[PDB]
One Martini backbone bead per residue (centre of mass of N, CA, C, O) as a GRO file, in nm:
protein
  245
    1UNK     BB    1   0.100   0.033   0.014
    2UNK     BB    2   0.131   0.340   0.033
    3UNK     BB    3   0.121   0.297   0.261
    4UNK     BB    4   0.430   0.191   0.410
    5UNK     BB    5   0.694  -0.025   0.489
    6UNK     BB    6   0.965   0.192   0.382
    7UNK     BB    7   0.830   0.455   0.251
    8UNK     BB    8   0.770   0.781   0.113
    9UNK     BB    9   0.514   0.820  -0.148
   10UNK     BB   10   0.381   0.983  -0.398
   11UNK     BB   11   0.138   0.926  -0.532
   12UNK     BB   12   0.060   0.752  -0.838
   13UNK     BB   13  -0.129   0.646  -1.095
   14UNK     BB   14  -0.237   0.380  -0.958
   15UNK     BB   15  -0.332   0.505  -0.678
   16UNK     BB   16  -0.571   0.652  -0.797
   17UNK     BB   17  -0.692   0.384  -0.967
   18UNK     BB   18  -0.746   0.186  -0.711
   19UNK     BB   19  -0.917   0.382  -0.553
   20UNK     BB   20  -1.128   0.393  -0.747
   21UNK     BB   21  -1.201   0.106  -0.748
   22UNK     BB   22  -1.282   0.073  -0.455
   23UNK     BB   23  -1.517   0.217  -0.479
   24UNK     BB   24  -1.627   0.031  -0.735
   25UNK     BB   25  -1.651  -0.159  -0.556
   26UNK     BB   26  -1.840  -0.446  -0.426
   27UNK     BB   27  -1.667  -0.698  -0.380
   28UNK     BB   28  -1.602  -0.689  -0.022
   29UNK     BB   29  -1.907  -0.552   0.039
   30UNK     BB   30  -2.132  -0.472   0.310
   31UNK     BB   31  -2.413  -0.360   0.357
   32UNK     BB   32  -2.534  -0.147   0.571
   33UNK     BB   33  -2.688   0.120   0.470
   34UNK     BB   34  -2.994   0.285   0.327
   35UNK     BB   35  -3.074   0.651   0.318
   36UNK     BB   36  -3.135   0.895   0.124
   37UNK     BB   37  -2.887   0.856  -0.051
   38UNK     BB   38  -2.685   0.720   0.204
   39UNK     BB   39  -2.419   0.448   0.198
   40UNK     BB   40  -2.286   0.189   0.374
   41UNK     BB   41  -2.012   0.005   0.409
   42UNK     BB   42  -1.825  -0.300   0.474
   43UNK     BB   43  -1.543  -0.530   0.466
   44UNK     BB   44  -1.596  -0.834   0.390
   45UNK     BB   45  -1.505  -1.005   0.688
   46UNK     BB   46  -1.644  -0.958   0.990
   47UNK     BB   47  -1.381  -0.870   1.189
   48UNK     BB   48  -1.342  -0.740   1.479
   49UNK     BB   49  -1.042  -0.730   1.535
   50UNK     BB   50  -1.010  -0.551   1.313
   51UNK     BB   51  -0.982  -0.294   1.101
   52UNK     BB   52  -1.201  -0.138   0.886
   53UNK     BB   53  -1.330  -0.066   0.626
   54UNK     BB   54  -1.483   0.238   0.500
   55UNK     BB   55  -1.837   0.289   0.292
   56UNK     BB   56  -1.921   0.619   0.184
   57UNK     BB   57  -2.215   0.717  -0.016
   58UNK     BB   58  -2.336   0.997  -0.199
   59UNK     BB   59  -2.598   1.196  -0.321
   60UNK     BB   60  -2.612   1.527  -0.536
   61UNK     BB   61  -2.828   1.672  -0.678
   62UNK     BB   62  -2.774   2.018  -0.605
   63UNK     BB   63  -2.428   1.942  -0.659
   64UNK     BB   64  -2.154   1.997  -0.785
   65UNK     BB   65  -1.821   1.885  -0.816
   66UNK     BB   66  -1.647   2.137  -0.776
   67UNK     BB   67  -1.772   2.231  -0.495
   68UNK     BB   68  -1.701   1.984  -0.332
   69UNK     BB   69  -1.398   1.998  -0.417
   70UNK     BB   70  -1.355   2.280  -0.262
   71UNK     BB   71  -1.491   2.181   0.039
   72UNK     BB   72  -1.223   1.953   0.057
   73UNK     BB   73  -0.996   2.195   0.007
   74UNK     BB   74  -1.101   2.412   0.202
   75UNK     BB   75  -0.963   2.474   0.535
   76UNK     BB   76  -1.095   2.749   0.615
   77UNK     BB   77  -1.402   2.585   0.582
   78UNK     BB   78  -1.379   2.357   0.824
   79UNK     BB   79  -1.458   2.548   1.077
   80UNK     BB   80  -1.755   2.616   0.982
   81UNK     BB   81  -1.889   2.297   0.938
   82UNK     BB   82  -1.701   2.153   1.161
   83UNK     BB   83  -1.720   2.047   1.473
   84UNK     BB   84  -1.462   1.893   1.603
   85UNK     BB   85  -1.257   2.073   1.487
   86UNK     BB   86  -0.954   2.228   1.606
   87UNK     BB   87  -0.746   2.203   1.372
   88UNK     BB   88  -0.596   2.305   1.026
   89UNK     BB   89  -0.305   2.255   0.783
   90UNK     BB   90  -0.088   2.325   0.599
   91UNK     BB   91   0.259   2.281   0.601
   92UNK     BB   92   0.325   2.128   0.307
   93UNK     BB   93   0.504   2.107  -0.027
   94UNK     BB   94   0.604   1.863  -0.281
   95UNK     BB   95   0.402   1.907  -0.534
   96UNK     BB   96   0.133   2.048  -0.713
   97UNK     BB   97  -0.035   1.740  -0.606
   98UNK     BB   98   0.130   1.759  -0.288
   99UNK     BB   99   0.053   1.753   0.060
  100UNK     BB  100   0.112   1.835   0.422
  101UNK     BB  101  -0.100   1.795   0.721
  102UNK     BB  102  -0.345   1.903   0.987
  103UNK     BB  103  -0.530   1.742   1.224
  104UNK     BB  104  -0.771   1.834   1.453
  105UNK     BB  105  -0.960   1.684   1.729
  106UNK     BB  106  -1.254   1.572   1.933
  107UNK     BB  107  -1.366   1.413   2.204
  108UNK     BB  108  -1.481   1.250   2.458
  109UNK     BB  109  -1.405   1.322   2.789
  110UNK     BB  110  -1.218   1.103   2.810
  111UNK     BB  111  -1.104   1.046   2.523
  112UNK     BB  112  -0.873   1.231   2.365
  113UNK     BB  113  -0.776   1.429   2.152
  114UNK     BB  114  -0.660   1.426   1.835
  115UNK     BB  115  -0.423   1.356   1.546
  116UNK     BB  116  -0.317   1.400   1.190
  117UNK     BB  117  -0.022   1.347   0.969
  118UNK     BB  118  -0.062   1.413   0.611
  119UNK     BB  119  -0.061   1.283   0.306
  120UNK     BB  120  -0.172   1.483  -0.008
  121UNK     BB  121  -0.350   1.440  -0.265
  122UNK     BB  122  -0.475   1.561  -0.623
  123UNK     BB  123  -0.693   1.435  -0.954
  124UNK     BB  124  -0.851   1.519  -1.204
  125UNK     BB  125  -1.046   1.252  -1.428
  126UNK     BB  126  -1.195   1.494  -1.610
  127UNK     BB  127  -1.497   1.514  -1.430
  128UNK     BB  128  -1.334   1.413  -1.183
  129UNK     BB  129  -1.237   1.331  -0.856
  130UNK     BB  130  -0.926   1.296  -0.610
  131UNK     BB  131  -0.867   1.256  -0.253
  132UNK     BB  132  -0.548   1.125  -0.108
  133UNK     BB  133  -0.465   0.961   0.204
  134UNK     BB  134  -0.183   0.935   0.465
  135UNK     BB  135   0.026   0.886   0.700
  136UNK     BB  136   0.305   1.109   0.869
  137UNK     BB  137   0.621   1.194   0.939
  138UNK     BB  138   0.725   1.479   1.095
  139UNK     BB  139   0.989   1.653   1.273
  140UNK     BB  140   0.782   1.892   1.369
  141UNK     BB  141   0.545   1.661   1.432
  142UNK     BB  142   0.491   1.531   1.720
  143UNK     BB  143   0.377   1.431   1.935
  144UNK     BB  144   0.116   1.508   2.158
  145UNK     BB  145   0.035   1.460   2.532
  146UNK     BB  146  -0.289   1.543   2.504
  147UNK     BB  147  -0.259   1.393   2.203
  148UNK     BB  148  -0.369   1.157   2.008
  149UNK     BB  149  -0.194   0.998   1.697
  150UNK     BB  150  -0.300   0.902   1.439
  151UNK     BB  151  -0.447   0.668   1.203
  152UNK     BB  152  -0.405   0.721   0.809
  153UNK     BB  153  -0.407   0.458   0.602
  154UNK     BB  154  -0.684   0.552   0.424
  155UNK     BB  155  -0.813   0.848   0.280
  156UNK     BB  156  -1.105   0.942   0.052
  157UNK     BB  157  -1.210   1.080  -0.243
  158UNK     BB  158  -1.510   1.018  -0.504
  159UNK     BB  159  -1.593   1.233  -0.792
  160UNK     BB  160  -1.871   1.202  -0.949
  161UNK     BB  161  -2.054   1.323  -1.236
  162UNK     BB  162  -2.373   1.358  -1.341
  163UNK     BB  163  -2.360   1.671  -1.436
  164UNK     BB  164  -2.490   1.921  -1.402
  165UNK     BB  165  -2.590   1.987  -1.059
  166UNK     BB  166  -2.382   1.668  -0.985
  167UNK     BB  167  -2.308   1.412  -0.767
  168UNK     BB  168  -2.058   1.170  -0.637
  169UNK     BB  169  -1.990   1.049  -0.322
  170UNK     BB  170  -1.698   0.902  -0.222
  171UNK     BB  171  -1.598   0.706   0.103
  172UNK     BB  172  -1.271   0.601   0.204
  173UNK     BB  173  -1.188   0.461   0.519
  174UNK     BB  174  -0.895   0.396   0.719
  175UNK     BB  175  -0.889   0.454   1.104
  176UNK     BB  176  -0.664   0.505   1.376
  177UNK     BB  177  -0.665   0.587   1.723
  178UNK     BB  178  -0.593   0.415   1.903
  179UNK     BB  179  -0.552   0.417   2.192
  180UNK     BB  180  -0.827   0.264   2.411
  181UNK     BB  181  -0.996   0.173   2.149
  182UNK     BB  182  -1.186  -0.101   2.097
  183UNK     BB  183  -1.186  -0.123   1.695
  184UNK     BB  184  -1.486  -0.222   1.717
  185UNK     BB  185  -1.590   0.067   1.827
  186UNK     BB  186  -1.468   0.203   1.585
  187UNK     BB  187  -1.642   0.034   1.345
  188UNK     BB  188  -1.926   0.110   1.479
  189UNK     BB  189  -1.902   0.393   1.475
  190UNK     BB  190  -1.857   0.487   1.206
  191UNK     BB  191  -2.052   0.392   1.070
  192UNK     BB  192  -2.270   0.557   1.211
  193UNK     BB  193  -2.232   0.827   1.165
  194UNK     BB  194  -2.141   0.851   0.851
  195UNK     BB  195  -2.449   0.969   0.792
  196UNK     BB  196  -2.376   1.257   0.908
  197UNK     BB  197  -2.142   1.377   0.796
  198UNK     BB  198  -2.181   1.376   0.489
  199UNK     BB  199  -2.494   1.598   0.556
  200UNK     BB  200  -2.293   1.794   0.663
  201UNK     BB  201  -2.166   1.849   0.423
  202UNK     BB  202  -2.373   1.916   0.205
  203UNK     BB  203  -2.457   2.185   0.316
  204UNK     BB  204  -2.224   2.322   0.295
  205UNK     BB  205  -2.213   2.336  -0.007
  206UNK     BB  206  -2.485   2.522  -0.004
  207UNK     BB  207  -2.296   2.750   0.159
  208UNK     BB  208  -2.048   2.799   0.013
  209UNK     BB  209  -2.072   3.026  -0.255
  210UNK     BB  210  -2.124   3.247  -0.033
  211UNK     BB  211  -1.875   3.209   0.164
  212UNK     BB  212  -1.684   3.252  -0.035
  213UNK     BB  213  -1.725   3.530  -0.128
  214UNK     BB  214  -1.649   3.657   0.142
  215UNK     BB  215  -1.323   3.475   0.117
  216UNK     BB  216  -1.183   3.491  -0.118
  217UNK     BB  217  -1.297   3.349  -0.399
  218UNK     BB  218  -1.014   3.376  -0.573
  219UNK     BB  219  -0.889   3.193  -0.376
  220UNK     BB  220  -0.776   2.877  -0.516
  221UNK     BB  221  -0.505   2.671  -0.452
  222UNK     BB  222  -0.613   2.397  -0.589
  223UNK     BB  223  -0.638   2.555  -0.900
  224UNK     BB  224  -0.406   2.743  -0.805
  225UNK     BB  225  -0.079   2.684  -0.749
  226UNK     BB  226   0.031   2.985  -0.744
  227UNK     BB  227  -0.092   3.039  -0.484
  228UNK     BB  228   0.098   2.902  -0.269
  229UNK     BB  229   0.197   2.953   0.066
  230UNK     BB  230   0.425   2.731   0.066
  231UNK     BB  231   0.613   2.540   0.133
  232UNK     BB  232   0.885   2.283   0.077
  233UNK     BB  233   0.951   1.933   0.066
  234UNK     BB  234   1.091   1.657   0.049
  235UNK     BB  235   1.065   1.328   0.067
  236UNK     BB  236   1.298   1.243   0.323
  237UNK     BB  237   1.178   1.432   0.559
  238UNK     BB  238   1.008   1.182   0.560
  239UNK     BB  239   0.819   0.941   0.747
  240UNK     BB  240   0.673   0.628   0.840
  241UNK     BB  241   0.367   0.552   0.942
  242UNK     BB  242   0.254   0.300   1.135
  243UNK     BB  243  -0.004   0.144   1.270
  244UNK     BB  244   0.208  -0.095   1.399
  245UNK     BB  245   0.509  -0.115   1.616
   0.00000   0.00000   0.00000
């Protein structure tokens, strides 16, 4: 897997590929949940005992697959609509569709807020659109004493355009809180939550174009490279994150 056991390395055309073969596979993947257009799937395996990968689609029938696109890629509009996130930044950039960033979020009470530092990339393939991520170590953000380390093994979305002004939009994650919570208790929940992110995500895409409009509508560095305000950094400045070490 591109998350890998030797190095870390920018996704390739293959990994993109892969990715999306993944979204579009049915078999190896047992229906969990599906109503009002939002479905997910788990892992046709049902072994409790280690960590599943998640299959989240939803239809969209009136936003356009560009809008999801930017509300996926504009970090700056992430604290407006996610209630969870704490921070999060991208910290470096690799290649002109691949950079390093910041994830933190809050849990509840008992359990320590989380964090977690990826490797994203980013290919527009026609009409569609991938954006895919795996956890990496940066050598300037090691863990803090605070916040549990979170490990992502593989999350991406798969946004496929259905016309104008209408899209599919597939996520598959499959994450690592670590910590004390057991593995199935994580199953179980990203599970159930599932269908209730996308549709906060949804919801988001439709008051986009507004708050875009208030917030340098034009910056969209995710669209125009040369807008990017970031450093870059070398792929070797990167150490590979284990899922378990």
């Amino acid at each position: 897997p591109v998350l890998g056991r030797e190095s870390v390395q920018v996704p390739d055309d293959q990994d993109f590929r892969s990715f999306r073969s993944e979204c579009e596979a049915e078999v190896g993947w047992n229906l969990t949940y599906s109503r009002a257009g939002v479905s997910v799937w788990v892992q046709a395996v049902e072994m409790d005992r280690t960590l599943h990968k998640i299959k989240c689609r939803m239809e969209c029938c009136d936003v356009p697959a560009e809008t999801l696109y930017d509300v996926l890629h504009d970090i700056e509009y992430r604290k407006k609509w996610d209630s969870n996130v704490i921070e999060t930044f991208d910290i470096a950039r690799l290649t002109v569709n691949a950079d390093v960033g910041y994830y933190s979020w809050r849990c509840p009470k008992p359990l320590k807020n989380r964090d977690v530092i990826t490797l994203r990339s980013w290919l527009p393939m026609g009409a569609d659109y991938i954006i895919m991520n795996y956890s990496v170590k940066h050598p300037k953000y090691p863990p803090r004493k605070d916040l549990v380390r979170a490990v992502s093994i593989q999350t991406g979305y798969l946004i496929q355009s259905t016309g104008p002004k209408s899209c599919v939009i597939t996520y598959l994650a499959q994450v690592d809180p670590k910590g004390s919570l057991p593995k199935w208790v994580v199953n179980k929940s990203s599970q159930f939550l599932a269908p209730k992110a996308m549709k906060k995500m949804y919801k988001a895409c439709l008051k986009y174009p507004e708050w875009k409009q208030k917030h340098l509508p034009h910056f969209k560095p995710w669209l125009h490279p040369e807008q990017s305000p970031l450093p870059s950094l070398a792929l070797s400045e990167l150490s590979v994150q284990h899922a378990d070490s």
